[PDB]
Structure 1
Amino acid sequence: HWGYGKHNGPEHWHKDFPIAKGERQSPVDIDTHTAKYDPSLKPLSVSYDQATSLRILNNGHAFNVEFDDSQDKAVLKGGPLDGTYRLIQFHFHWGSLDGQGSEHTVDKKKYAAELHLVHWNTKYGDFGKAVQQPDGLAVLGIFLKVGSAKPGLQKVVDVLDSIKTKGKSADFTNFDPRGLLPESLDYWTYPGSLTTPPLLECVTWIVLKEPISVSSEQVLKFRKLNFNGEGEPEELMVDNWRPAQPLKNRQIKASFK
């Protein structure tokens, strides 16, 4: 199956997922000088006060902190979005070294990692129906740089030892995602897709300009995870990021300056 290795990596995905060479694929490089301020954008609203996490899972590609989305809690709206989008899960993409790891890039700069908070448009009933629509999903992307530790990320870092291999999961309740947000909500936005197979083009990307800082120790533990399942040759879970894709006919809008 698909992965990030030499024989099943990003350059191979198009064979089983033709949309990989589509017209609105993600991620993309964000040319800050070409991005245009858009006054038509309404204030971005991130309301995670009632967010209820359920568990954390190593799916062999990354680890997902899943949330209970059966009720109107943890919602993203405003900005380029029409209606309400509900948080369903978040995960990260990171590198084998601090100099790489992010999927989106800023003026070609690669950050150490990137956090993806996934939300589905509530007008579609559920996530399954949402991914069949051009505006079914909204992913809030946040860059991670190595420096000071991010207090709010430690609970995630400490449970990773219990889900080292593919298929393992652990209870992960009462985690507050607000502890992973930077100060400013300044962002860039554009229409894109999932960055992992099936690469569906149903995503409105909202990428924050301000990255959060995490310690070398915290990201080092991310790199201790495995892509493989238990009892299999160990393949460290690193560099699970897709490189920048062609922008084609899309414009990146800025919410600031």
Structure 2
Amino acid sequence: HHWGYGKHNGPEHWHKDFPIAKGERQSPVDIDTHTAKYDPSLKPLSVSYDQATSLRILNNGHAFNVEFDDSQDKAVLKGGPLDGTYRLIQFHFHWGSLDGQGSEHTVDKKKYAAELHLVHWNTKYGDFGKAVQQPDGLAVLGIFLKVGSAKPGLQKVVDVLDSIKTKGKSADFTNFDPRGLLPESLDYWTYPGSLTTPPLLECVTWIVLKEPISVSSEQVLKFRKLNFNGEGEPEELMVDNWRPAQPLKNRQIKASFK
């Protein structure tokens, strides 16, 4: 009886196994765009993904992860609110059963169809398991998805999904360039928060881009063909794998842009 996104094991239940679910810096949050303050001291973000090495795509039972080689500084995030160098380890998405829901962060209470998380860890902590025990251990770049025109750089991800339909399946996934997932602008909001799934550790500097990327209806429909279950188990479609907004508590959301 482990955590998930159903009636009986979804977000409102997680606190019983993970009491930090009710902590002081949980994610996601609603981004009130009128209350976020421009911070002219924030630097532009530096996204350096030209040397990225994707390796594998995995259905882990709660999303799919595209994993990278993070044994060297190859694809890194720096600048912005960050001190130091954060290495890309994986990306994944959260999405809905309908186009009107799916994102974890919201903007003035608006839900997007999906949200991409590019997860990076602070190299001063040596590896990822150590980083998630630190308050500045991770930087997750969040990018909203709206349904409209297709995103050509997403199609290679969409097309491999039928090979990882069920929990615990993985497939080779080399030479994927995550630059094709980014919007044109790197304007962002940033705040200190947490992992959005158990163990819900309070180790993340969140950087959420203001500009969404567009994806087609057909692209998101393929996300919704994935399964939460393992092979040979009753089919339960992987949809609505998002945690709702949590209380902001004693935090301020900063904007990189006026």
Secondary structure of the corresponding residue to residue 116 of structure 1: strand
What residue is the counterpart of 1:205 in the other structure?
206
SS at match of 1:71: coil
Q: 2 CA distance for matches of 1:183 and 1:114?
A: 16
Contact 2:44 2:186 in 1 (8 A): no
Q: Find the aligned partners of 2:45 and 2:235 in 1 and give their Cα distance.
A: 42
Partner residue in 2 for 1:153: 154
Under a length normalisation based on structure 2, what TM-score does the superposition of the two structures give? 0.99
- Asked if structure 1 preserves the Cα contact closer than 8 Å seen for 2:66 and 2:92, the reply is yes
Tell me, yes or no, if the aligned pair for 2:97 and 2:224 is still in contact at 8 Å.
yes
Distance 2:34 2:190 in 1: 14
1:216 to partner: Cα distance = 0.1
Q: TM-score, normalised by structure 1?
A: 1.00
Give the SS at the match of 2:221: helix
Q: Secondary structure at the match of 1:42?
A: coil
Q: How far apart, in 1, do the equivalents of 2:135 and 2:86 lie?
A: 14
Question: Shift of the alpha carbon at 1:74?
Answer: 0.4
Q: Name the CA distance, whole Å, in 1 between partners of 2:41 and 2:256.
A: 9
Which deviations, in whole Å up to 9, do the C-alpha atoms of 1:197-256 show, x marking residues without a partner? 000000000000000000000000000000000000000000000000000000000000
In 1, Cα distance between the equivalents of 2:81 and 2:30? 19
* Alpha-carbon distance between aligned partners in 2 of 1:39 and 1:213, rounded to the nearest angstrom: 29
Give percent identity, aligned residues only: 100
The question of 1:185 aligning with 2:183 is answered no
Contact 2:77 2:88 survives alignment (8 Å): yes
Residues 140-172 of structure 1: CA distance to partner in whole angstroms, max 9, x if unpaired? Answer: 000000000000000000000000000000000
Distance 1:186 1:230 in 2: 41
Q: CA deviation at 1:47?
A: 0.4
Secondary structure at the aligned position of 2:103 is classed as coil
Secondary structure, aligned partner of 1:11: helix
- Aligned-residue RMSD, C-alpha: 0.3
Q: Structure 1: 5+ residue runs without aligned partners? A: none
CA distance in structure 1 between the aligned counterparts of 2:122 and 2:41, rounded to whole angstroms: 20
Partner of 2:140 in structure 1? Answer: 139
- Runs of 5+ consecutive residues of structure 2 not aligned to the other structure: none
Q: CA deviation at 1:40?
A: 1.5
Q: Deviations over 1:172-194 (max 9, x none)?
A: 00000000000000000000000
State how many pairs are aligned.
257
**Secondary structure in 2 matching 1:57:** strand
2:251 is matched with which residue? 250
**Deviations for 1:115-164, whole angstroms, at most 9, x for unmatched residues?**
00000000000001101100000000000000000000000000000000
What is the rounded CA distance, in whole Å, between the counterparts of 2:72 and 2:17 in structure 1?
A: 35
Distance 1:42 1:239 in 2: 34
Q: Please list every run of at least 4 consecutive aligned residues from structure 1 whose deviation after the TM superposition is greater than 3 angstroms.
A: none
